[PDB]
Ligand SMILES: Nc1ncnc2c1ncn2[C@@H]1O[C@H](COP(=O)(O)OP(=O)(O)O)[C@@H](O)[C@H]1O
């Protein structure tokens with residue numbers, strides 16, 4: 010059985026971090 | 041019985057979120 | 072004695088073909104089992120290699 | 126014809142014996158392959174239930 | 180079979196051939212770019228047996244065939260074998276005759292002109308295709324990936340072209356053509372496997388080494404650290420089944436094959452690797468281009484499916500690239516198939532219906548027309 | 555019987571083994587690389603009779619022995635038989651004790667590592683040699699031939715190496731290594747002699763065919779014209795006297811055996827032939843390298859001794875090579891002995907003394923040291 | 930991602946149940962076929978005993 014459960018969890022966490030990261034980058038970019 | 045690579049790297053992606061979020065929050069608090 | 076040797080031979084030859092057939096069927100099952108084993112271990116190893124990271 | 130039928134009967138007894146051995150080898154190999162293959166790879170999918178958690 | 184005169188699309192290189200119709204999201208069939216021929220004298224009569232085998236036929240009966248690739252290092256040289264491949268590629272499996280359907284084929288700006296001229300000429304003069312277009316594979320990878328800007332590092336079978344595109348424009352002066360590809364990675368691996376006691380010389384042996392590579396090898400993120408462990412312990416070794424029951428055990432050789440991409444000197448090439456070429460394609464461009472190309476490094480084609488390659492490249496590129504700036508790689512599961520997919524997208528765009536070379540234009544201008552019309 | 559504390563040199567391959575001391579211009583003797591064992595039941599007693607025979611002993615008593623060699627296409631597998639050969643060669647024939655002398659052994663650079671590791675290990679652990687150096691046969695060939703540059707075709711009993719070297723540097727990407735060798739040529743000759751009515755099966759029969767090959771076989775300058783006459787007329791036939799007084803007469807088969815080197819399909823091998831692989835080694839090298847390799851096609855090993863081989867190789871290359879370039883074969887009398895001679899040169903060079911592995915270094919590092927110090 | 934949950938459980942539960950059952954169901958079929966092999970051994974012995 011393919012580990013599709015985590016291809017999907019990965020994407021969810023990827024989105025969670027990408028969004029937190031987008032904010033980390035903006036928060037610093039905002040000065 | 042989980043996989044160490046998955047458990048750890050899922051946590052690393054959670055950490056990119058947690059760390060990025062902490063960076064976002066502190067940076068935004070100042071910026 | 073011939074009727075018995077021939078009857079026993081032909082009968083036993085049916086036991087030969089029945090055991091042989093069963094061997095081939097068990098081998099097709101073994102193969103299918105090997106194939107599923109292989110497919111599963113590989114699907115997991117594949118997916119795991121893809122998902123070792125995260 | 127009897128010696129030949131006996132050879133055939135004996136052949137079939139031996140062929141059957143070889144296949145009694147090969148059926149048991151396939152019965153044990155199919156058994157072992159299933160016993161280790163679905164038991165391990167299905168276990169690996171059970172492990173998927175946990176491996177892919179987190 | 181088709182309910183519209185949809186263009187046919189095919190990515191056909193020194194490695195494999197991917198084909199299907201425009202409008203799909205995948206090729207319908209994939210073949211190797213191989214034409215096989217028997218290398219033995221027939222002994223039995225009434226055995227059938229072909230004079231030549233094409234694609235998958237060539238690999239299936241390979242035990243007694245010599246297998247040749249009509250395309251080498253990105254270019255078609257054996258046009259006769261290509262006609263056989265194109266027929267099999269578009270008609271035998273898709274059941275679509277090019278005579279009633281436009282065809283879209285791929286290459287790159289530093290790919291010698293004869294490739295684009297023969298691709299265009301064969302489909303027009305042998306298959307009577309009503310129209311042709313030759314696309315840059317980088318263009319197609321970027322369409323498939325949802326981008327107009329990025330570096331497409333195509334690390335294929337015979338050549339790496341590394342073609343930068345910005346906002347849908349080619350930046351040809353910055354293309355870094357590298358003499359390192361999957362075919363050389365196969366050659367490296369058989370030499371290192373020879374060091375371990377497994378010599379591979381004949382066609383069958385060569386095709387086996389390519390299979391070992393495709394399934395067992397990986398890039399990883401740090402080869403010095405990977406080697407420190409792989410060279411010290413059996414825990415990183417993997418067994419491969421040779422189709423004769425022999426088993427070959429591969430250790431640090433498992434990543435030293437793809438490592439060539441980060442060490443071309445392994446095959447005698449004067450290069451620091453594919454991340455250096457990605458870096459240089461970006462560097463050669465004006466800085467207002469560079470920032471977007473670094474943020475959009477794109478993987479396409481072959482070798483993009485080695486575990487660790489997308490991540491290894493981002494690490495290797497950020498290590499060369501200026502700091503502060505974000506360096507990122509685009510590497511979707513639609514990798515290696517992104518060129519075909521982009522061909523489908525491009526062939527079917529309503530605005531692309533003005534980009535096709537028609538048969539009438541071709542017949543009036545001759546084979547060189549592709550150089551005037553494609554890019 | 556030697557008068558100096560010099561190094562020992564021994565070119566021990568799958569065919570024959572050459573040995574003497576460093577500093578000479580020839581081996582003291584050449585022996586077959588054979589350990590023989592009785593294949594018959596004894597009836598008389600008090601007949602002496604060894605469990606095993608080595609080199610000349612193995613060949614001299616061969617009538618009742620089955621004979622085996624330890625090296626399989628260049629790789630040592632039977633290290634115990636190598637021990638017997640090295641012991642006899644150094645102790646009885648060179649009349650030296652390895653314990654008191656450095657020893658140089660040889661192998662192709664692409665030869666599997668176990669070979670170089672066992673040569674280093676056995677001389678240090680069973681013979682207690684004070685020092686070791688596994689040499690590259692191509693280097694030794696160039697040193698014997700008076701060159702720093704050229705393609706070395708060692709076309710031996712085991713494997714044909716075929717490596718380009720320029721200004722003393724290896725050009726490994728261009729080594730067209732080939733599994734086509736003198737041991738296959740002998741088996742081929744046995745099959746075609748069978749076609750003529752002279753069957754050969756056993757070790758004695760194999761030794762006889764090898765002797766036939768070494769004295770009667772040739773390449774010729776033109777295979778097609780040579781067979782047109784040789785297969786049609788007795789004028790090109792040559793007889794050979796078998797040890798039992800029978801006479802075998804051989805026609806075009808006399809050249810079909812060496813022809814196999816140019817036509818590998820004769821033994822079922824998929825290969826371009828030794829002259830095309832030589833050509834490709836030259837062509838694979840850079841433009842400023844190629845001119846020097848065309849002018850320097852270098853011979854070593856056996857098979858280089860067939861009449862017409864030097865000339866057919868020069869003709870095959872000049873026929874493939876571009877104009878202006880002068881294509882030349884270097885085929886000195888030092889033929890078959892080029893490697894032994896080079897071994898003597900390398901072992902004795904003052905610029906090589908630091909390259910020797912000492913016993914103390916070996917004991918501290920273990921057998922893997924051969925890859926740190928030799929190649 | 931309800932699908933990751935559907936898959937993480939569907940992969941495990943559907944397969945462990947169906948698959949382990951096939952292992953033991955067939956193990957019994959196989960054991961019975963192995964008994965047939967024993968019965969053929971018995972049949973061969975009996976035929977020989979009857980014929981002296
Ligand atoms: N898992 C993998 N590992 C290594 N190489 C791969 C893998 N998958 C694909 N490739 C390589 O893809 C190459 C063909 O790629 P491709 O880019 O489509 O050629 P092109 O685009 O120039 O027409 C082959 O050499 C094949 O070995």
Ligand SMILES: Nc1ncnc2c1ncn2[C@@H]1O[C@H](COP(=O)(O)OP(=O)(O)O)[C@@H](O)[C@H]1O
Nearest residue numbers: 565567569710711736768855856857859860890
């Ligand atoms: N007259 C000859 N013609 C062709 N080959 C020869 C002749 N004499 C000897 N040889 C060959 O020389 C080979 C052994 O020499 P050599 O190549 O120097 O050993 P090594 O491979 O270690 O270098 C054997 O295959 C033998 O048959």
